[PDB]
């Protein structure tokens, strides 16, 4: 699973012991679900609307993995 992959790399970093917190916001009629994860002092989230909570975790996990592959910061 994609979520599992985070743990694999997270543990490989000397027991990172990351934490994930779900963020709920928006109007009651149109609720918004997001997934947030802490990574060595750097927290990432997925600003996307997901039908289910599990889906939100998937999106958030993808973002975290992308950062690892490429920081995206230059000069």
Swiss-Prot record:
Span of domain DRBM: 1-70
Result of knocking out the encoding gene: Flat, serrated, blue-green and ovoid leaves.
Protein origin, superkingdom: Eukaryota
Compartment list: Cytoplasm
Complex and partners: Heterodimer with DRB1 or DRB5. Interacts with DCL1 and DCL5.
Functional summary from the UniProt entry: Binds double-stranded RNA. May be involved in RNA-mediated silencing.
Protein name: Double-stranded RNA-binding protein 2
Organism: Arabidopsis thaliana
Lineage: Eukaryota, Viridiplantae, Streptophyta, Embryophyta, Tracheophyta
Gene: DRB2
């Amino acid at each position: 699973m994609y979520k599992n992959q985070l743990q694999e790399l997270a543990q490989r970093s000397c027991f990172n012991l990351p934490s994930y917190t779900c963020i709920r916001e928006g109007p009651d009629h149109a609720p918004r679900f997001k997934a947030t994860v802490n990574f060595n002092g750097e927290i990432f989230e997925s600003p996307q609307y997901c039908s289910t909570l599990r889906q939100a975790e998937h999106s958030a996990a993808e973002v975290a993995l992308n950062a690892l592959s490429n920081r995206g910061l230059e000069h």
